Nucleic acid binder design. Structure first.
Ligand code: 8DG
Ligand code: MG
Ligand code: MG
Length: 314
DNA sequence: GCCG
DNA sequence: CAGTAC
DNA sequence: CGGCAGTACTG
């Protein structure tokens, strides 16, 4: 858990990421993970090369940081990167939009606010800019889960509500709250976004909607914004997903993450003639859905030993 | 960027 | 669809 | 050479 190479490599990874070089940024992210969980400090080029996730090129960069104290490429990062990061930290704006605003001459959030064309989602990101960069204490994520759960349960007592994401992975702070709802009755989950969201609105808890297709009877997710009542409260991102019970174990696995963990698990299923999504684990193609009543069944069918959510925190 |  | 998001 | 996870809204 100790390295001084990763500090330098993260700056590069983030730069490629905000410039839209998503594959290169992915190679970096994994290299960093490998470096992060190596016992020893890495000392030989030979030793770097030996690691999975670390190729010829990553090894040369490591040998440079060791040999000298620096990575020369860090001196040549595009001058646009800090601005592109500023702009892609607006919820609903990504690298393409950031790059366009840059090309148009914008350089600050004041330029965005006064001159840029914003989508509805972006106007909401912008207005909650600081809040959405903050992580909340896990105790607050608890209160948010409980607000959602009380609202759901009032409608139907048998509804099951579990906070997922970082919260379920045991983290002390959380970027937002992700709540998964199902019903062991196989049926009653259907159509409730109507009732649940209307309830949470009546209380004034939800302050804005980001993604909510409420014209569709088969809406899967709500992504939006909430604020607990009373003084000293900030706006928080809230994600709610409602899933049939047969999909509960796959939904829980998915929504718990981490994102890297899921990508890795899916890559791996794929090497075994299988396919893993938030809905199911299947044979590959028309494939067959396999029965997965618990997360442990997903692990077992992939030939892997179970991992507690706290150990998925890649 | 990494890997098969 | 492209972009963005989980 | 070429995948790199698989899927859900928006406009
Ligand atoms: N953010 C993100 N989440 C993903 C992706 N793919 C994916 O399956 N997920 C799942 C795994 C995440 O743990 C889950 C919830 O997303 P999230 O952004 O709220 O993630 P989180 O709770 O783990 O982290 P955080 O909010 O505390 O920052 O959605 C992805 O590419 N990005
Ligand atoms: Mg953004
Ligand atoms: Mg989260």
């Amino acid at each position: 858990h100790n390295l001084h190479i990763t500090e330098k490599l993260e700056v590069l990874a983030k730069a490629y990421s905000v410039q839209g070089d998503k594959w290169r940024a992915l190679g970096y992210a994994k290299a960093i993970n490998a470096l992060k969980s190596f016992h020893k400090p890495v000392t030989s080029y030979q030793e770097a090369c030996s690691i999975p996730g670390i190729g010829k090129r990553m090894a040369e960069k490591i040998i440079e940081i060791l040999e000298s104290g620096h990575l020369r490429k860090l001196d040549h990062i595009s001058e646009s990167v800090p601005v592109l990061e500023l702009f892609s930290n607006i919820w609903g704006a990504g690298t393409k939009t950031a790059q366009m605003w840059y090309q148009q001459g914008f350089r600050s959030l004041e330029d965005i606010r006064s001159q840029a064309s914003l989508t509805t989602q972006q106007a909401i990101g912008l207005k909650h800019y600081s809040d959405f960069l903050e992580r909340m204490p896990r105790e607050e994520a608890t209160e948010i889960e409980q607000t959602v759960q009380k609202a759901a349960q009032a409608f139907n007592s048998g509804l099951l509500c579990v906070a997922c994401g970082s919260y379920r992975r045991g983290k002390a702070t959380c970027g937002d709250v992700d709540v998964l709802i199902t019903h062991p009755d196989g049926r009653s989950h259907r159509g409730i976004f109507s009732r649940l969201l209307d309830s949470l609105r009546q209380e004034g808890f939800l302050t804005d909607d980001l993604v909510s297709q409420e014209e569709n009877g088969q809406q899967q997710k709500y992504l939006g914004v909430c604020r607990l009542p009373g003084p000293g409260r900030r706006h928080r991102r809230l994600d709610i997903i409602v899933v049939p019970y047969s999909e509960f174990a796959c939904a829980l696995l998915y929504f718990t993450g981490s994102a890297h963990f899921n990508r890795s698990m899916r890559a791996l299923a794929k090497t075994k003639g299988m396919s893993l999504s938030e809905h199911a684990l299947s044979t590959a193609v028309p494939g067959r859905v396999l029965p997965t009543p618990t997360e442990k069944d997903v692990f077992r069918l992939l030939g892997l030993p179970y991992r507690e959510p706290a150990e998925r925190d890649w």
